[PDB]
């Protein structure tokens, strides 16, 4: 995990959220696919509550665009200070914030409620109460006296576990860990890379545990979830860019029983 110390947010954002992976115009892309999964899931209106925690936010907010309308208290987290600062910069509309507006626009497009994207960002920025540091390896990943309401009504995590875990069993424990933050009967929306083993974030070179839909399902089960949905996106050639070796992307809607 010392590799994460060379991790550059601006390089990561650039690699994954700027064209081509960042062009949202093509519906068959990975960005539109991620957003649709979240939109659809929340649109069921079975995922709901007062509080929600985003595990391993990094420098990104997209994972919460659809979510923000169903939970009034939203908590974001990451391991690195540089990311929290990068989040802050966008939350407070500071100088040099990253432009998520294409993503805001698309979420509004997908949820199809005629909402304008400034209302969407406005609601998100507002509903996010705190940005916290976090380590999923710790059995209490948020420490002892966290400003975060526990247990949360729901959890969201994208591209975290498989990226901070050396192997399957490690990945499994990380899940066990964060699962403890989730109220019984609550919800988890997990996104991650499939059969990925490395990706770059500037000068840093992160090791990833290559997982599969089957491994991922089984791990959610082991952690005590009822899997409600598990969808797979296969990474198209034109989005294989030399920033990683991701083969596909998985999305899971799991419920703590």
Ligand X SMILES: Nc1ncnc2c1ncn2[C@@H]1O[C@H](CSCC[C@H](N)C(=O)O)[C@@H](O)[C@H]1O
What residues pair up with 55 in beta bridges, in sequence order? 157
Smallest CA-to-CA distance from 11 within 86, 65, 81 is with: 86
Task: Rule CB under 8 A: choose which of 45, 95, 96, 112 binds its own copies.
Answer: 112
Nearer to its own copies, 101 or 140 (CB): 101
Instruction: Pinpoint the alpha helices (H) of 92-212.
Output: 101-111, 117-127, 161-164, 168-179
The span from the CA of 46 to the CA of 29, in Å, is 27
Tell me which stretch binds ligand X (CB under 6 A): 65-73, 77-85, 143-151, 220-228: 77-85
Q: Using the rule CB under 8 A, which residue among 47, 53, 65, 108 binds its own copies?
A: 108
How far apart are alpha carbons 74 and 124 in whole angstroms?
8
Residue 135 assigned as binding residue: yes
67 binds ligand X (CB under 6 A): no
With contact defined as beta carbons under 8 Å apart, do 9 and 86 qualify?
yes
Kindly report the CA angle at 142 between 136 and 145, in degrees rounded to 5? 160
For its own copies, the closer CB: 44 or 118 = 118
To its own copies, the closest distance from the beta carbon of 36 in angstroms equals: 9
Residue 84, CA atoms < 13 Å, CB-side half-sphere: 13
Q: Which is nearer to its own copies, 116 or 150 (CB)?
A: 116
Q: How many Cα atoms within 13 Å fall on the side-chain side of residue 110?
A: 26
Q: Does 82 bind its own copies (CB under 8 A)?
A: no
Under the criterion CB under 6 A, does residue 172 sit at the interface with ligand X? no
Stretch of residues binding ligand X (CB under 6 A), selected from 25-33, 55-63, 180-188, 246-254:
55-63
Q: Minimal CA–CA distance to 91: which of 108, 75, 107?
A: 75
Exactly one of 28, 44, 118, 240 binds its own copies (CB under 8 A); that residue is 118
**CA distances (Å), 191 to each of 90, 115, 201, in order?**
22, 25, 19
For its own copies, the binding residues (CB under 8 A) are 24-25, 27, 32, 105-106, 108-110, 112, 114, 116-119
Binding site as annotated, residues for S-adenosyl-L-methionine: 12, 17, 56-57, 62, 78, 83, 135-136, 158
Residues in contact with ligand X by the rule CB under 6 A: 1, 4, 7, 56-58, 60, 63, 78-80, 83, 134-137, 158-160, 163-164
């Amino acid at each position: 995990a010392s590799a994460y110390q060379r991790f550059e947010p601006r390089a990561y954002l650039r690699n994954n959220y700027a064209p081509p992976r960042g062009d949202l115009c093509n519906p068959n892309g990975v960005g539109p696919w991620k957003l649709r999964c979240l939109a659809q899931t929340f649109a069921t209106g079975e995922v709901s509550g007062r509080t929600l925690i985003d595990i391993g936010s990094g420098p990104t907010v997209y994972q919460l665009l659809s979510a923000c309308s169903h939970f009034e208290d939203i908590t974001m987290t990451d391991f690195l200070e540089v990311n929290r600062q990068e989040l802050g910069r966008w939350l407070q509309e500071e100088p040099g914030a990253f432009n998520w507006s294409m993503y805001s626009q698309h979420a509004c497009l997908i949820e199809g409620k005629g909402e304008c994207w400034q209302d969407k960002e406005r609601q998100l920025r507002a509903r996010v109460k705190r940005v916290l540091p976090i380590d999923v390896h710790q059995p209490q990943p948020l420490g002892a006296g966290s400003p975060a309401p526990l247990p949360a009504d729901a959890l969201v995590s994208a591209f975290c576990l498989e990226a901070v875990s050396p192997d399957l069993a490690s990945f499994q424990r990380a899940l066990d860990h964060i699962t403890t933050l989730l109220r019984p009967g609550g919800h988890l929306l997990l996104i991650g890379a499939l059969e990925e083993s490395w990706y770059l974030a500037g000068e840093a070179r992160l090791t990833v545990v290559p997982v599969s839909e089957e491994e991922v399902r089984e791990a959610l089960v082991r952690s005590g979830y009822k899997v409600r949905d598990l969808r797979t996106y296969i990474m198209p050639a034109h989005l294989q860019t030399g920033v990683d070796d991701v083969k596909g992307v998985f999305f899971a809607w799991a419920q703590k029983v």
